[PDB]
Protein backbone atom coordinates (compact mmCIF):
# COMPACT_ATOMS: atom_id res chain seq x y z
CA UNK A 1 0.00 0.00 0.00
CA UNK A 2 1.13 3.60 0.69
CA UNK A 3 5.14 3.18 1.55
CA UNK A 4 6.58 6.95 2.34
CA UNK A 5 9.97 7.76 2.80
CA UNK A 6 11.34 9.32 6.38
CA UNK A 7 12.93 12.66 5.68
CA UNK A 8 15.60 12.83 8.05
CA UNK A 9 16.84 15.87 9.99
CA UNK A 10 20.35 15.57 12.77
CA UNK A 11 20.46 18.45 14.57
CA UNK A 12 20.84 19.76 18.67
CA UNK A 13 18.60 21.49 20.94
CA UNK A 14 21.17 24.67 21.25
CA UNK A 15 23.51 25.85 19.40
CA UNK A 16 26.65 24.34 19.86
CA UNK A 17 29.25 25.01 21.96
CA UNK A 18 32.37 22.68 22.54
CA UNK A 19 32.62 21.29 26.02
CA UNK A 20 28.96 22.66 26.97
CA UNK A 21 26.13 20.23 27.57
CA UNK A 22 23.29 19.83 24.63
CA UNK A 23 20.73 17.45 23.13
CA UNK A 24 21.37 15.62 19.77
CA UNK A 25 18.43 14.95 18.33
CA UNK A 26 17.25 13.01 15.49
CA UNK A 27 14.00 14.10 13.94
CA UNK A 28 12.13 11.22 11.56
CA UNK A 29 8.70 12.80 10.00
CA UNK A 30 6.73 11.48 6.99
CA UNK A 31 7.21 8.07 6.93
CA UNK A 32 4.85 4.99 6.14
CA UNK A 33 4.05 2.50 7.42
CA UNK A 34 4.79 3.31 11.24
CA UNK A 35 7.91 0.29 11.47
CA UNK A 36 10.96 2.66 11.77
CA UNK A 37 14.50 1.90 13.17
CA UNK A 38 16.68 5.21 14.24
CA UNK A 39 19.79 5.12 16.09
CA UNK A 40 22.23 7.81 17.05
CA UNK A 41 25.91 7.52 16.26
CA UNK A 42 28.69 8.93 17.96
CA UNK A 43 32.02 8.37 15.84
CA UNK A 44 30.64 5.48 14.00
CA UNK A 45 29.18 3.48 17.14
CA UNK A 46 25.55 3.40 18.28
CA UNK A 47 24.32 5.35 21.45
CA UNK A 48 22.80 2.84 23.77
CA UNK A 49 20.80 5.53 26.10
CA UNK A 50 18.92 7.19 23.47
CA UNK A 51 15.10 8.06 24.35
CA UNK A 52 12.48 8.73 21.43
CA UNK A 53 8.95 10.76 21.55
CA UNK A 54 5.53 8.69 21.36
CA UNK A 55 4.48 7.87 18.12
CA UNK A 56 2.28 10.50 16.80
CA UNK A 57 1.37 11.86 13.28
CA UNK A 58 0.36 14.86 11.51
CA UNK A 59 -2.39 15.72 9.25
CA UNK A 60 -1.62 14.25 6.20
CA UNK A 61 -1.60 10.53 8.43
CA UNK A 62 2.12 10.48 7.95
CA UNK A 63 4.10 9.61 11.04
CA UNK A 64 6.86 11.35 13.03
CA UNK A 65 9.21 10.66 15.82
CA UNK A 66 11.84 12.45 17.73
CA UNK A 67 14.96 10.54 19.21
CA UNK A 68 17.49 12.54 20.97
CA UNK A 69 19.90 11.71 23.94
CA UNK A 70 22.27 14.12 26.26
CA UNK A 71 25.82 14.40 25.31
CA UNK A 72 28.21 16.93 24.74
CA UNK A 73 29.63 18.69 21.47
CA UNK A 74 33.49 18.92 21.13
CA UNK A 75 35.71 19.72 17.89
CA UNK A 76 36.85 16.38 17.01
CA UNK A 77 33.70 14.18 18.21
CA UNK A 78 30.93 12.94 14.69
CA UNK A 79 27.66 12.25 15.06
CA UNK A 80 25.19 11.15 13.24
CA UNK A 81 21.79 9.69 13.00
CA UNK A 82 20.87 5.76 11.26
CA UNK A 83 17.69 5.34 9.65
CA UNK A 84 15.97 2.18 7.87
CA UNK A 85 12.75 1.54 6.65
CA UNK A 86 10.79 -0.44 4.14
CA UNK A 87 10.88 2.22 1.66
CA UNK A 88 15.07 2.69 1.93
CA UNK A 89 17.07 -0.15 0.61
CA UNK A 90 19.68 0.54 2.71
CA UNK A 91 20.03 2.28 6.09
CA UNK A 92 20.57 6.15 5.48
CA UNK A 93 22.87 8.02 7.67
CA UNK A 94 23.17 11.60 8.03
CA UNK A 95 25.98 13.28 9.70
CA UNK A 96 25.50 16.02 12.37
CA UNK A 97 26.25 19.45 10.80
CA UNK A 98 26.30 22.62 13.68
CA UNK A 99 25.39 24.65 10.72
CA UNK A 100 23.51 21.91 9.44
CA UNK B 1 -5.18 33.28 20.12
CA UNK B 2 -6.71 30.23 18.42
CA UNK B 3 -6.39 26.88 20.31
CA UNK B 4 -7.00 23.00 19.82
CA UNK B 5 -7.05 19.30 21.47
CA UNK B 6 -6.13 16.89 19.46
CA UNK B 7 -6.01 12.85 20.35
CA UNK B 8 -4.08 10.45 17.88
CA UNK B 9 -4.55 7.24 17.72
CA UNK B 10 -2.70 4.35 15.77
CA UNK B 11 -3.30 0.84 15.73
CA UNK B 12 -0.97 -2.00 13.56
CA UNK B 13 -1.81 -5.61 13.03
CA UNK B 14 1.23 -7.45 13.78
CA UNK B 15 0.45 -10.57 12.37
CA UNK B 16 2.11 -14.31 13.93
CA UNK B 17 3.26 -11.66 16.62
CA UNK B 18 0.09 -11.76 18.95
CA UNK B 19 -2.12 -8.79 19.70
CA UNK B 20 -1.92 -5.77 17.86
CA UNK B 21 0.20 -2.19 18.64
CA UNK B 22 -2.07 0.59 19.95
CA UNK B 23 -0.42 3.78 20.87
CA UNK B 24 -2.57 6.84 21.62
CA UNK B 25 -1.28 10.36 22.14
CA UNK B 26 -2.81 13.40 23.17
CA UNK B 27 -2.19 17.33 22.30
CA UNK B 28 -2.89 20.74 23.36
CA UNK B 29 -2.16 23.09 20.78
CA UNK B 30 1.47 21.87 19.54
CA UNK B 31 2.34 19.63 23.46
CA UNK B 32 1.47 16.64 23.89
CA UNK B 33 0.13 15.81 27.62
CA UNK B 34 -1.01 12.46 28.04
CA UNK B 35 0.32 8.86 26.37
CA UNK B 36 -0.65 5.24 26.05
CA UNK B 37 1.13 2.14 24.63
CA UNK B 38 -0.46 -1.27 24.54
CA UNK B 39 2.93 -2.55 25.12
CA UNK B 40 3.88 -0.81 28.16
CA UNK B 41 3.57 -2.38 31.61
CA UNK B 42 1.55 0.28 32.95
CA UNK B 43 -1.56 -0.21 31.06
CA UNK B 44 -2.75 2.88 32.18
CA UNK B 45 -2.81 6.65 30.74
CA UNK B 46 0.39 8.42 31.56
CA UNK B 47 1.33 12.37 31.96
CA UNK B 48 3.17 13.47 29.60
CA UNK B 49 2.94 17.47 30.25
CA UNK B 50 4.37 18.56 33.94
CA UNK B 51 0.55 20.83 34.72
CA UNK B 52 -1.34 17.32 33.73
CA UNK B 53 0.12 15.33 35.93
CA UNK B 54 -1.19 17.39 38.99
CA UNK B 55 -4.53 15.48 37.84
CA UNK B 56 -6.14 13.62 40.98
CA UNK B 57 -6.64 9.83 40.40
CA UNK B 58 -10.46 10.28 39.10
CA UNK B 59 -8.93 11.88 35.91
CA UNK B 60 -6.23 9.44 35.14
CA UNK B 61 -8.79 6.29 35.75
CA UNK B 62 -11.32 7.74 33.70
CA UNK B 63 -8.88 8.10 30.89
CA UNK B 64 -7.52 4.65 31.51
CA UNK B 65 -10.37 2.61 30.85
CA UNK B 66 -11.73 5.21 27.88
CA UNK B 67 -8.30 4.31 26.08
CA UNK B 68 -8.61 0.73 26.78
CA UNK B 69 -11.83 0.83 25.45
CA UNK B 70 -10.68 2.43 22.10
CA UNK B 71 -7.66 -0.15 22.09
CA UNK B 72 -10.70 -2.97 21.71
CA UNK B 73 -12.24 -0.53 19.36
CA UNK B 74 -9.54 -0.27 17.01
CA UNK B 75 -8.50 -4.30 17.74
CA UNK B 76 -11.66 -5.23 16.21
CA UNK B 77 -11.59 -2.36 13.50
CA UNK B 78 -8.75 -4.29 12.04
CA UNK B 79 -10.66 -7.49 11.39
CA UNK B 80 -13.70 -5.43 10.26
CA UNK B 81 -11.68 -3.51 8.07
CA UNK B 82 -9.23 -6.66 6.76
CA UNK B 83 -13.13 -8.24 5.50
CA UNK B 84 -13.87 -5.27 4.04
CA UNK B 85 -10.98 -5.78 1.85
CA UNK B 86 -10.77 -9.31 1.44
CA UNK B 87 -7.15 -9.15 3.06
CA UNK B 88 -5.43 -12.15 4.50
CA UNK B 89 -4.06 -12.79 7.82
CA UNK B 90 -0.18 -12.48 7.41
CA UNK B 91 0.15 -9.10 6.43
CA UNK B 92 0.43 -5.95 8.97
CA UNK B 93 -2.08 -3.35 8.38
CA UNK B 94 -2.11 0.10 10.10
CA UNK B 95 -5.40 2.07 11.35
CA UNK B 96 -5.15 5.48 12.62
CA UNK B 97 -7.88 7.67 13.77
CA UNK B 98 -7.98 11.54 15.30
CA UNK B 99 -10.29 13.81 16.66
CA UNK B 100 -10.29 17.00 18.52
CA UNK B 101 -11.75 20.33 18.33
CA UNK B 102 -10.18 24.19 17.58
CA UNK B 103 -11.04 27.27 19.57
CA UNK B 104 -11.01 30.70 18.78
CA UNK B 105 -9.19 33.65 20.24
CA UNK B 106 -12.70 34.04 22.40
CA UNK B 107 -12.02 30.53 22.94
CA UNK B 108 -15.33 29.20 21.52
CA UNK B 109 -15.87 26.33 19.46
CA UNK B 110 -14.50 26.54 16.11
CA UNK B 111 -14.35 23.46 14.13
CA UNK B 112 -14.56 19.77 15.24
CA UNK B 113 -12.65 16.69 13.89
CA UNK B 114 -12.91 13.13 13.51
CA UNK B 115 -11.59 11.15 10.83
CA UNK B 116 -9.78 7.62 9.86
CA UNK B 117 -7.06 6.25 8.23
CA UNK B 118 -6.31 3.00 6.62
CA UNK B 119 -2.86 2.43 5.75
CA UNK B 120 -1.63 5.76 5.33
CA UNK B 121 -4.78 6.31 2.89
CA UNK B 122 -8.28 8.62 3.64
CA UNK B 123 -11.36 6.08 4.94
CA UNK B 124 -14.07 8.22 6.54
CA UNK B 125 -14.00 11.85 7.75
CA UNK B 126 -16.70 13.48 9.39
CA UNK B 127 -17.46 16.92 7.15
CA UNK B 128 -17.52 20.25 8.82
CA UNK B 129 -21.15 20.25 8.99
CA UNK B 130 -20.57 17.56 11.60
CA UNK B 131 -23.74 16.25 10.26
CA UNK B 132 -22.48 14.06 7.14
CA UNK B 133 -18.83 11.84 6.09
CA UNK B 134 -16.76 11.42 3.42
CA UNK B 135 -15.93 8.14 2.69
CA UNK B 136 -13.09 7.71 -0.48
CA UNK B 137 -13.73 4.14 -1.59
CA UNK B 138 -16.82 1.40 -1.38
CA UNK B 139 -15.74 -0.22 1.98
CA UNK B 140 -16.18 3.23 3.92
CA UNK B 141 -19.50 3.50 2.31
CA UNK B 142 -20.37 0.53 4.63
CA UNK B 143 -19.22 2.29 7.69
CA UNK B 144 -20.80 5.12 7.05
CA UNK B 145 -23.92 3.53 6.44
CA UNK B 146 -23.62 1.90 9.97
CA UNK B 147 -22.64 4.90 11.54
CA UNK B 148 -25.62 6.68 9.53
CA UNK B 149 -28.27 4.35 11.16
CA UNK B 150 -26.53 4.61 14.56
CA UNK B 151 -26.47 8.31 14.40
CA UNK B 152 -22.73 8.26 15.34
CA UNK B 153 -22.54 12.01 13.98
CA UNK B 154 -25.29 13.52 17.05
CA UNK B 155 -22.99 11.52 19.56
CA UNK B 156 -19.81 12.70 17.94
CA UNK B 157 -21.22 16.52 18.09
CA UNK B 158 -22.46 16.75 21.24
CA UNK B 159 -18.45 15.52 22.34
CA UNK B 160 -16.83 18.12 19.86
CA UNK B 161 -19.07 20.96 20.76
CA UNK B 162 -19.16 20.14 24.49
CA UNK B 163 -16.88 17.91 26.79
CA UNK B 164 -14.19 18.15 24.34
CA UNK B 165 -13.51 22.25 24.17
CA UNK B 166 -14.61 23.02 27.65
CA UNK B 167 -11.37 20.11 28.74
CA UNK B 168 -9.85 22.40 25.95
CA UNK B 169 -10.55 25.18 27.94
CA UNK B 170 -9.81 23.72 31.21
CA UNK B 171 -6.15 22.53 30.52
CA UNK B 172 -5.73 26.16 29.22
CA UNK B 173 -6.18 27.76 32.34
CA UNK B 174 -4.15 24.95 34.28
CA UNK B 175 -1.03 25.20 31.99
CA UNK B 176 -0.92 28.76 31.05
CA UNK B 177 2.37 29.32 31.99
CA UNK B 178 2.62 26.42 29.24
CA UNK B 179 -0.31 26.59 26.56
CA UNK B 180 -0.76 29.93 26.64
CA UNK B 181 2.44 31.54 26.78
CA UNK B 182 4.06 33.24 23.18
CA UNK B 183 8.18 32.87 22.48
CA UNK B 184 8.98 34.77 20.00
CA UNK B 185 11.68 33.16 17.68
CA UNK B 186 15.19 34.15 18.25
CA UNK B 187 16.49 34.43 15.35
CA UNK B 188 20.02 34.85 13.73
CA UNK B 189 21.47 34.02 10.35
CA UNK B 190 24.71 32.02 9.34
CA UNK B 191 27.39 33.06 6.07
CA UNK B 192 28.86 29.75 4.64
CA UNK B 193 31.56 30.11 0.71
CA UNK B 194 31.00 26.76 -0.67
CA UNK B 195 33.12 28.34 -3.29
CA UNK B 196 35.17 31.55 -4.25
CA UNK B 197 31.78 32.97 -6.13
CA UNK B 198 29.15 31.26 -4.18
CA UNK B 199 27.48 31.60 -0.25
CA UNK B 200 25.02 29.84 1.70
CA UNK B 201 23.11 32.36 3.51
CA UNK B 202 21.01 30.15 6.83
CA UNK B 203 18.46 32.50 8.53
CA UNK B 204 17.59 30.56 11.83
CA UNK B 205 14.58 30.93 13.93
CA UNK B 206 15.33 29.25 17.51
CA UNK B 207 12.99 28.81 20.44
CA UNK B 208 9.17 29.88 19.65
CA UNK B 209 6.01 28.54 20.10
CA UNK B 210 3.54 27.84 19.07
CA UNK B 211 5.36 25.70 15.86
CA UNK B 212 3.35 27.63 13.21
CA UNK B 213 6.09 30.12 11.38
CA UNK B 214 7.71 31.31 8.02
CA UNK B 215 10.63 32.17 7.37
CA UNK B 216 10.85 33.46 3.36
CA UNK B 217 14.23 34.40 1.86
CA UNK B 218 13.50 37.65 -0.70
CA UNK B 219 15.75 39.93 -3.12
CA UNK B 220 15.13 43.23 -3.62
CA UNK B 221 11.82 42.14 -2.64
CA UNK B 222 11.35 39.04 -4.86
CA UNK B 223 10.58 35.66 -2.96
CA UNK B 224 13.37 33.34 -3.85
CA UNK B 225 10.93 30.20 -3.24
CA UNK B 226 12.23 27.53 -5.64
CA UNK B 227 15.53 28.65 -4.99
CA UNK B 228 14.95 28.93 -1.04
CA UNK B 229 15.77 25.29 0.91
CA UNK B 230 13.35 25.33 3.75
CA UNK B 231 12.94 22.30 6.48
CA UNK B 232 9.87 21.35 8.59
CA UNK B 233 9.66 23.00 11.63
CA UNK B 234 11.05 20.57 14.40
CA UNK B 235 11.09 19.81 18.08
CA UNK B 236 13.92 20.92 19.83
CA UNK B 237 13.05 18.56 22.89
CA UNK B 238 12.10 21.37 25.27
CA UNK B 239 8.60 22.37 24.40
CA UNK B 240 9.95 24.81 21.76
CA UNK B 241 10.78 24.55 17.57
CA UNK B 242 13.31 25.61 15.42
CA UNK B 243 13.34 25.99 11.37
CA UNK B 244 16.02 27.45 8.88
CA UNK B 245 15.89 28.81 5.48
CA UNK B 246 19.32 28.89 3.04
CA UNK B 247 20.03 30.38 -0.38
CA UNK B 248 22.62 30.35 -2.61
CA UNK B 249 23.80 33.92 -2.91
CA UNK B 250 26.71 34.92 -5.66
CA UNK B 251 29.71 36.40 -3.92
CA UNK B 252 28.81 40.58 -3.50
CA UNK B 253 25.24 40.77 -3.48
CA UNK B 254 24.48 39.26 0.62
CA UNK B 255 22.99 43.12 0.60
CA UNK B 256 20.76 42.34 -1.71
CA UNK B 257 19.32 38.95 0.44
CA UNK B 258 16.66 39.75 3.43
CA UNK B 259 15.07 37.23 5.91
CA UNK B 260 11.28 37.31 6.78
CA UNK B 261 10.15 36.06 10.06
CA UNK B 262 6.23 35.90 11.33
CA UNK B 263 5.42 34.49 14.59
CA UNK B 264 2.37 35.98 17.18
CA UNK B 265 5.57 35.97 19.60
CA UNK B 266 6.72 38.97 17.38
CA UNK B 267 4.96 42.53 17.59
CA UNK B 268 5.86 42.75 14.46
CA UNK B 269 7.11 40.43 11.63
CA UNK B 270 11.27 40.89 11.75
CA UNK B 271 13.12 41.88 8.17
CA UNK B 272 17.20 40.02 8.29
CA UNK B 273 20.31 41.21 6.60
CA UNK B 274 23.47 39.89 6.65
CA UNK B 275 24.93 43.83 6.27
CA UNK C 1 -10.65 14.29 28.06
CA UNK C 2 -11.15 11.47 25.90
CA UNK C 3 -14.47 10.28 24.35
CA UNK C 4 -17.03 7.50 26.49
CA UNK C 5 -18.39 6.23 23.30
CA UNK C 6 -17.25 3.31 21.64
CA UNK C 7 -17.41 3.97 17.74
CA UNK C 8 -17.10 1.25 15.39
CA UNK C 9 -16.15 0.75 11.69
Given at each position: ?86 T ?13 | ?45 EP ?67 Q?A ?6 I ?9 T ?30 V ?5 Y ?31 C ?22 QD ?48 | ?9
Amino acid sequence: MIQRTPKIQVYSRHPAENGKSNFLNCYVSGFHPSDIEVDLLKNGERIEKVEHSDLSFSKDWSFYLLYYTEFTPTEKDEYACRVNHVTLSQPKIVKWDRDM
Amino acid sequence: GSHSMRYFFTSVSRPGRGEPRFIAVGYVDDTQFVRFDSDAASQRMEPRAPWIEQEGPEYWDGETRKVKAHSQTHRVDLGTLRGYYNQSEAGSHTVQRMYGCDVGSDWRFLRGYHQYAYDGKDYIALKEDLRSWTAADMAAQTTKHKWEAAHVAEQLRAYLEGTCVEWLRRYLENGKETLQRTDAPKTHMTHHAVSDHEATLRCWALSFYPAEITLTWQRDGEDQTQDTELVETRPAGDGTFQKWAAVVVPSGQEQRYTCHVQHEGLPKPLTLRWE
Amino acid sequence: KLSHQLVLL
